[PDB]
Every structure is written in C-alpha cells, then in structure tokens.
Design a protein around this nucleic acid. Structure first.
Lengths: 99, 152, 59, 81, 113, 207, 127
RNA sequence: GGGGACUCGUGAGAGACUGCCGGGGUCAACUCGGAGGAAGGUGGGGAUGACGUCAAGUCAUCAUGCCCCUUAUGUCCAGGGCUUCACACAUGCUACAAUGGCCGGUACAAAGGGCUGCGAUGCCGCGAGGUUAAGCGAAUCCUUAAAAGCCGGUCUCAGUUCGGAUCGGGGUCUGCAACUCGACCCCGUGAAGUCGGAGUCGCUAGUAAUCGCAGAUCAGCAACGCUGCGGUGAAUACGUUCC
RNA sequence: CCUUACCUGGGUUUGACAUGCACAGGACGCGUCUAGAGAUAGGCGUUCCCUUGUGGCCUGUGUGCAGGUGGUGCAUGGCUG
C-alpha cells in the first residue's frame, strides 16, 4: 500500500541525512506509514581545468560536482499527513520533488 | 635504488609438472601480458620437445640451461679513463636468467616457422650444446680473462 | 569589445553563427556549457563557494 | 559528398541567371558566392566569383557541374621566389 | 588460369589470385566468385575453362579493368586538368588535394627530397 | 602563484557554500544573474564593509544574506537605498528579491574587511608600515584570534619597481587543514594604478 | 545459513552462499575449464592444499558478478578460504601461512595530469 | 510474488599506533627479527608546492596606471586568410607481419552521459546511414555488444593475403552552405617502409608494457590529441665507481 | 562564415553598447522591393503613460563620452610555472 515515492536531489550526505530523517520522522508522527530510508548510489560530475590565466602550462586541477541522492524513501497514501508533506519541505540545497 | 634491496615477487610451480623454472620462462616470454597465451606456447614447446626427443622437455631444458648458462661477466662498472672492462663472477640467478634471455632472443630471430617450432629447435640445439646462446657462453669465457684487475 | 559582445549575444541569423560567451568576464575559447563560464572566473567562484557542492577531489 | 537533394545555388544569383537564361547570356556577373553548385543550366554563362580579394571571371561547361564557385575562386598564392 | 592479365599464382587463395587485377579487390573477388559459386580458396592448378568463362562473363558484365578502366581514370584526370579548378591545379603541380599540408608531410605526393 | 584560498579545502569542512540551491537546467539562469547581482551589490557599498554575500534561491525569489560591517550604510535612509537596489533588482533576479542585512560583530575578524580597510588607508596616502601596524594591531588586539598574515603587493609608495612584503605575527599554519584561517583580500586604486593585499586570519581550528 | 562466500578481487567481485556436495564447482556451464581455459586460475581456485577432496566437497559456485575478467575472477579462492574458515579454523593458519588469507585488492594508479594511465612520461628533451 | 541472508548501495564506528614478544642499542633516541592480524613500523595515493629566486610569463582571460586612436587603431558586413610551402625541428598514430593478417563463432568490464536529449524494439539500406518508435529528466529506460581474450578454420614467411598512405569514382551526416576547408562509408591502386645512425627519453608492483572504454569542447569534425575508467600482466635491482 | 582580433572590399562613424545636457514624439515589431550582406527603401502593426508638467524611451542634433585583441609584464595588480 504505497503511493508516494520521494525524490531528493542533494549534494551533501550530512544535510540530506540530518534534515531528511527529521522531516520524515515528523511525517511519521503525523500518522504516515513510511518505508525506512534507502541509501542510494552517489553521483559526481567531474571537471578538470588549467590554472594558468594565459594558459601556457600543463598545470591542472580537478573538481567534482558531488550530487548526493540517498536515503530516498516511500510513504503510504496517508492524505492527512501528505498535506503537511506538501506544506513543509527542505532548503533549496536539497531539491525536493515527490511523486 | 642504492642500499636496502627489495623482495622480488615470488613465483610458483607451473600448472603442468611443477617447475618454477618454467614459470620463470613464461614470465620471460611474456609479451604484452598475454600470459595464458604464453603458457599455451610453452606447452606447445613441451609437446614438440617430447615429440622430438621422446623425454621430459623440462630436463632437456635443464641440460640446455646449464649448457648455455655462464658464471663470469666481462663488465662491472667504470674504472678510470682508458680502462675498458674488468670481468667479474656472476651469481646463479642472473646467470640463469641471462641464458634464458639469450634463448628467447635467438628464438625471436630465425624467420623460419612458428615460435613453438623454432623454440623447439633452439631447445634441442641448446640441450645438445649447439645453440648460439651456448656460443654466447663461449664468447663470455673467451672475452673474459682479459683485464684481470681489481674486480669492482 | 562591448559591440562584438552584443553581437555575440545577437540571437537570429543562423544560431550556429551565434557564439557562446562566458558572459561573466567575456571569453570566447574554453567555455564550459552548463556553467557558461570562461573556466577562469569559474576557478575564482570555485574558491569563493558559489557552487552546489562542487569540491576538489582527493582520489 | 553531400546535398543529395539537388544542387544548392544562392537564390539571389540563381534568379538572375534564370533571367539571363530567359533572354541570352550576359556580361560577367560579380557575386560573393564560393559555394553555389554548378549545373548544366549555367553552361555558356561566364561570371565572376569573389575569391576573398576580388570577383574573378570564370566560364562554365558540363564538366564543371561537380564543382563549386569556391573551387573556381582561388585565394592563396603559392611560390614565387 | 588466365582471364585478362597474368592472373597466375601458385598456392594462393582464389580471391587473392583475383587481387592481381588492376581494378578488382577482395570485395569484388568475393562478389564474382559468389556469382559463380566458386570457392574463395582455390588454386590455379585446379581450374578449368568453364570457370574462366563464367568469370570473364561476369567481369565484362560488372566492371572494367586497366586500359579501359585506367583510360576512364585518365579521362577524369584530364577533365580535372582542363577544368583547372583548385583540384586540377593540385594534380597539375603534383600537389595533394584531399585537404593535405605539404609544408611538413605529403612526402608520397611530393616525393623525397 | 603557488598559494591557495584555504576555503578551497574547507569547502565542506568548516566553510559554507554561498550558492544555496540545487538546479539542473535553471542553474545557468541563476548564476548568470549571480554575476550581475554580486557585482552591482558590491559596487558602491565600500562604506558598508561587505564581508560576504550568501544567496539562497527558492520560492521563485532570491534571499540575500549580507555579511556587512555597517548595515546602516546598506539600509541608507531607513531602507531607501536598500530598496533602491532591492525592489529594482526584482525584475532581473526573477520575481521579487529579499535582502537580509547581517551585522559583523567584530569586522577585525574578517580577512576581507581588514584587507579592504587597510588598502583604503594606503589609498589615503599614508605610510605603509604605520598603516600595517595599525591594521594588524587592531586586528589582533580586538579579535581573540590565534594569528595573522598580512601580505601586500604593489608599488608601496608609488615606486616604479613594485614589490611586496608581509608582517607575520603569531601563527598561520596553512599546510594543516583543520586550521580555521579566514581569508580575504582587496585591490585598492592608487595614483600609479592599484595595490593589492591578501589577509589570512588564524582564527582558530575546528569545533 | 549456508556458507557465505566472502573474498576480494581485482575489480569484479565473486561470491555466494554455498552448500556441500559432490565437488562440482561450476556455474551455468562455466566450469573451471570453460571459464578458465588456463589452469592457473583453475588450480588457484582448486586450492590444492584444501580441495573438494581434501575437505567436504562443495558444489555451489561463487556467483560471478561484475562480469568477471578471466584474470581477476580467479580471486574467488579468497571466497573459498573464507568459506573454509566458516567450516573450521584448522587450515586458517595453514591458509594464512600459505598466502591465501590476505587482501589482493589492487586496481590501478590514477591517471595523472600530464601523464598517461601507466605514468608514461613523454619523450623529454634536455636541449 | 515473497524475503533482508549475502552481495550491492550507503550513514556512522572499530581496526595498525611500535600496539606487542625476544634481541640489539648512549638504558634514551633508535633499531633487528618475530607473533597476532587484512595490512607492521610515514598501507598506498592524492590534495597540499616552506622562505625565496629566475626583471621567467600574461596589458590577448581578467584588472589597470601612463602613452596612443577615437570620421576610426571603433563599429556593421559578403568573402578571403589563421588550414599556404623548395626545407628543418619537436610531441604523437600505424606498420615494417606467423607471440602474425583475415572469415566465422564466443563469456566478461569499470566509470560516465541522455527529455534542446538518449533512440530500446522493429523496418530499410552492402555499409556508413535513413524511417518508425518504447522507456527514460535516469541504479530500474536507453547509452550497453566492451575490446584485447577464447574453440576452430584460412593464409604459411612474401614489399606478399604485411602495410592502407596517395589518388579516381560512388554513397552517408552537419549546416543556408563542406571549394578554399569538415567527418564517416563502399568500390578501386595497394605507396613508402623489412626494426632503425649519431644520440636519447621512458619505467620499481598491479608497476611498466599492452588492448579497449567513456566524457569535456562542438551545428558537424575527438576510433592519433587532452582529461577520467577498466582488462591482461612481466623482467632487473650485485651495487654507487663513473655520467 | 561567425568565431577572427588579421585582411580584400564594402558601409557606418556619440556610434553596436553604457550614459550626461536640450529638442523632438512612439519606440518597437511585422512583412516586403532593392542590395552580396550590412543597411537602404515601401507598407503594415503604433506613442502606454494622463510625451496633463514629471514619468518611459528610441530616433535626430550638439557635447560630455562610449569604445579599442593599439602599445606599454622593463609601470603594474591578479593568477599561473
């Protein structure tokens, strides 16, 4: 009896963990039956670039866009708590989109 | 490096009749990492050696090996200015592996037929005291005994 | 430039004739798509902290 | 080895050549086009192609149909000593 | 074992034997040999006249070979020359045409010093 | 040349990201505005003492946290100037923008603000050494920090041959990452062009 | 409940829970002779010291996973060694002192900025 | 379906620190050997580049003082040229074949990317490609068959079945447009060249070597370059006299 | 092509853009002849705001200026080896 599939797009394991477990716990407090958190694989969009401004060197650096999606769970169809789920979300740092 | 040698990666017995010597042979003929292939090639040489000789290829390699192997190098290091080279005794391992290196090189030469066939040819010549690698041992000993000076 | 920038910003006439510029400092060559940057000011922002978790790796 | 769907000719010139085909061949016509493809309908029409420096006259035949105006508009200069 | 040119090898595959024709590679060899139903690996020693007849007929029915073929090539070349466009000009000067840089390379086309 | 901004290592250790949002396609739409937003806001607020600007993009509106030494300068006449720069920028950021002016409790702790201030002092045609002593003195006496390095580079008196020097006091162990070393800088105009300064503040280590 | 295979590899890890039986150690028709033409990894898996004949014979082949390169896939013998530990400890000093209770997780060195995969520094010129 | 046991994913901890035995050693520093253990004595690696130097470099990323132009040294535009060569130099791709070329068959990645998009499936086309179109804004859809490898066959040591450069013809793609000046494919020739002077770089453990893979950039051109992944997988190290 | 800063040649030349002082009142977009393009050129669409004064703002005039991949790293920052 599941209906609500959560999707969160974060880039910080700590932020998505600390904030998700609390807002989800409070959703449970409002009466929703919820599947436990699901740690999902991590994502990194890596970039490499020259340091030199005139760019007359082979000296390089290496960055990575550490996109973090984990602990993405599922909520049973409990409207009286779904309303609160819709009204209460997380900071933009964690992109909340729910099916 | 200088002082403090590093341990070599241990080698084991061949999956055929146990021999670290043959294992080493495979490692010496390994080209581009095709090591299973190299084993196939060597095993082919075992088959040709036994086909040609009627006995254990491995001990024919033992005879060939001792026949080729020298025990006295003709070069150590830099001495002075006009001084050429000073010969010096060689330890069993390096002497052995040099012999194997000669066998491989001359097997790589001789554009005749397959590697297994030309290996088998070199194996029997070497085991019979006919290999050019044995002639290299001859060169080792003749070119030696020259600047019998301070062996650095 | 200040005219060729406006020209570069000029949309019509064969968008392939249009040319993507950093738009922060101006840079024709070596411009990364998503950020849309010159890959220099990118470094400055990378150190500044203007990215959503784009950090240096340490593999 | 492209434009499988017919020869490509610059429209503004194509029309002019069409009128000339309607009446008769006319004097060497200047034009900044190094890409229009030669077709049999251009045979007999000598006209000039900007080659990066100036409009250079060139005459057309059937053998030239597989060639462009840029192939008929030399730009660089080789040796000279 | 002859159709037009020598075409006389020994201990060769048949398609490779066919590669001795100025104008026929492995592909065309397999096409005609497929048309005849004749194996790709078959030496000249095992050939008969009927086979040469089928091959001859299919060659005449499929393409041209040197003399005729090359003459067509020279006709195309001379066409390039008479056109005198950039392409013909590279052929006229012994220069490359297919987007090459003789400054450093194109030593096959230019020859060694 | 061979020195870095320590924040580049403390990006997810002790420092925060100023860009507070997640975006996939609209990301470019955000940052292409962040350029002009930051440039236009930074320009003209010299008296304010702009330490840092943090930005959250959410609810189709921008929220700007201004780490400034003097909120009253950004506010202006009870918000007249703040609204001048806020209300008018609403059509560019994307439907409404909200300022949140933050008061720096001790500007001396801000490497960027000390850098700016002392660089402006040099733009007031003062003795370099005396200016450095004053800036450093206040920036180590009034703060409770563990160290400072102030490095200046330029003509230093308007010399034809430029140069640089620094007055390290205490500790600035940059090669260690657990250190809390704040970093800022400022490039001040002078008669013969402009002179730069970088400031490192060995504030502490880690919680 | 069955003997949980646990062992490392070079890149594509191989392991499953197993049960004892005949000694028919294969998977999906991929016998040791089908999956390992060579006898090197065959025999390394055989663990001559402790084979299906030395000890309780086992059938459930360590599940492949990660594809399995023909070299590194021989690493499942680490799985066998751990399976033997799950059986008893008597050969744990035998296996550790032999050289089967180790790690072997080595992959490759990271490709460097100005170098190749294998740090193949280019042909420099000191003039 | 059902399950949470493993794997896998993944948060947080433990664990290796001379911890430890014996021995040595100015007892200390320090160290030999050893147990245990997954690793034993900065595991490996990365990021990190002291103070300072070379008037190194850049006004063309950016910034900017002075000087200069400012009916033009700015601005707009078709086209050209930056892609030229009698020569030279450098870094690189492939070969100079039998540890080999080719037909046919065949298990196996990892890491990434994709709703402007990925194009499954299926259709057509000799193929490159073209049509239709599922699912997918993604661990699930697609990208996705990895290739080297392996069973067998062919060819049997040749400038040849090596090598595919040059050049003609004929097809595909992008873009309004592919001549200057793009990429790919089919046919056709099958060039030079048979292991390299003098000289010299590279490389100590999953190394080196070697075969593939995928991104960034882009209308298109990245299967020689640059940045990441992964398969197979060696050898030598007596030693510091000399460069 | 653009990119391109170079150039053949063609046009503009307070300008492509920012923007000050006055006048002026649609701008702007569409479509179209011309022209290689730029632009020229015709016709459409048209000035909200109270161009009620102010506001918006092109265009035009004149001027502040704009602008410069012009030089100057042996003026210099910055950044890099």
């Amino acid at each position: 009896g599941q209906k609500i599939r959560i999707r969160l797009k974060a880039y910080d394991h700590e932020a998505i963990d600390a904030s998700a477990r609390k807002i989800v716990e409070t959703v449970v407090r409002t009466g929703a039956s919820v599947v436990g958190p699901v740690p999902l694989p991590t994502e990194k969009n890596v970039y490499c670039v020259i340091r030199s401004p005139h760019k007359y060197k082979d000296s390089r650096e290496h960055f990575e866009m550490r996109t973090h999606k984990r602990l993405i769970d599922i909520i049973d169809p409990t409207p009286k708590t779904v309303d609160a789920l819709m009204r209460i979300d997380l900071p933009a740092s964690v992109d909340v989109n729910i099916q | 490096p200088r002082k403090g040698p590093a341990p070599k990666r241990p080698l084991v017995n061949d999956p055929v009749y146990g021999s670290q010597l043959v294992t080493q042979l495979v490692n010496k003929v390994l080209l581009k990492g095709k090591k299973s292939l190299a084993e196939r090639i060597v095993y082919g040489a075992l088959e040709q050696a036994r086909d040609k000789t009627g006995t254990d290829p491995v001990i024919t390699l033992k005879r060939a090996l001792d026949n080729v192997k020298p025990a006295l190098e003709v070069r150590s290091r830099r001495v002075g200015g006009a001084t050429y080279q000073v010969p010096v005794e060689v330890r069993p391992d390096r002497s052995t592996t040099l012999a194997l290196r000669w066998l491989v090189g001359y097997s790589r030469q001789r554009r005749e037929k397959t590697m297994i066939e030309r290996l088998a040819n070199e194996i029997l010549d070497a085991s019979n005291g006919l290999g050019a690698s044995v002639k290299r041992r001859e060169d080792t000993h003749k070119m030696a005994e020259a600047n019998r000076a301070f062996a650095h | 430039k200040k005219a060729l920038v406006n020209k570069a910003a000029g949309k019509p006439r064969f968008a392939v004739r249009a040319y993507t510029r950093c738009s922060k400092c101006g840079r024709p060559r070596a411009v990364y798509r998503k950020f849309g940057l010159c890959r220099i000011c990118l470094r400055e922002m990378a150190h500044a902290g203007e990215l959503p978790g784009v950090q240096k790796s340490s593999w | 080895r492209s434009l499988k769907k017919g020869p490509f000719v610059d429209e503004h010139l194509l029309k002019k050549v069409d009128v000339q085909n309607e009446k008769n061949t006319k004097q060497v016509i200047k034009t900044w086009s190094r890409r229009s493809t030669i077709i049999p309908d251009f045979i007999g029409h000598t006209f000039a192609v900007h080659d990066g420096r100036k409009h250079v006259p060139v005459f057309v035949t059937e053998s030239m149909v597989g060639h462009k105006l840029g192939e008929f508009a030399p730009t660089r200069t080789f040796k000279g000593h | 074992a002859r159709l037009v040119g020598v075409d006389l090898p020994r201990d060769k595959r048949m398609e490779v034997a066919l590669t001795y024709i100025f104008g026929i590679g492995r592909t065309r060899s397999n096409e005609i040999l497929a048309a005849t139903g004749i194996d790709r690996d078959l030496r000249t020693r095992d050939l008969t006249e009927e086979q040469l007849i089928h091959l001859r007929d299919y060659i005449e029915a499929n393409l041209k070979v040197e003399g005729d073929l090359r003459r067509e090539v020279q006709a195309d070349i001379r066409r390039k020359i008479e056109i005198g466009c950039y392409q013909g000009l590279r052929h006229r000067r012994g220069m490359p045409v297919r987007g090459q840089r003789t400054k450093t390379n194109a030593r096959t086309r230019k020859g060694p010093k | 040349g061979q020195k870095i901004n320590p924040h580049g290592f403390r990006l997810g250790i002790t420092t925060d990201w100023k860009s507070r949002w997640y975006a996939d396609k609209q990301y470019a739409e955000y940052v292409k505005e962040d350029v002009a937003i930051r440039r236009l806001l930074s320009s003209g607020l010299e008296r304010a003492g702009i330490a840092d600007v943090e930005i959250e993009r959410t609810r189709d509106r921008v929220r700007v946290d201004i780490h400034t030494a003097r909120p009253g300068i950004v506010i202006g006449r009870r918000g007249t100037e703040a609204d001048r720069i806020r209300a008018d920028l609403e059509k560019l950021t994307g439907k409404q923008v909200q300022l949140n002016i933050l008061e720096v409790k001790n500007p001396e702790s801000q490497a960027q603000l000390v850098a700016q201030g002392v660089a402006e002092q040099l733009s007031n045609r003062v003795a370099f050494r005396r200016a450095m002593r004053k800036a450093i003195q206040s920036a180590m006496r009034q703060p409770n920090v563990k160290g400072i390095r102030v490095q200046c580079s330029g003509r230093l008196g308007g010399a034809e041959m430029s140069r640089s020097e620094f007055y390290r006091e205490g500790r600035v162990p940059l090669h260690t990452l657990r250190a809390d070393i704040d970093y800022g800088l400022y490039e001040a105009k002078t008669t013969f062009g402009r002179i730069g300064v970088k400031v490192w503040i060995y504030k502490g280590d880690i919680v | 409940r069955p003997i949980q295979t646990v062992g490392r590899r070079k890149e594509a890890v191989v392991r499953v829970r197993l049960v004892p039986g005949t000694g028919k150690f294969d998977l999906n028709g991929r016998s040791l002779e089908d999956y390992f033409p060579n006898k090197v990894h065959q025999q390394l898996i055989k663990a001559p010291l402790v084979t299906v004949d030395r000890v309780e014979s086992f059938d459930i082949f360590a599940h492949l996973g990660g594809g399995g390169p023909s070299g590194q896939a021989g690493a499942l013998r680490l799985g066998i060694a751990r399976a033997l530990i799950l059986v008893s400890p008597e050969d744990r000093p035998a296996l550790k002192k032999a050289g089967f209770l180790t790690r072997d997780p080595r992959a490759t060195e990271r490709k460097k900025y100005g170098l190749k995969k294998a740090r193949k520094a280019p042909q420099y010129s000191k003039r």
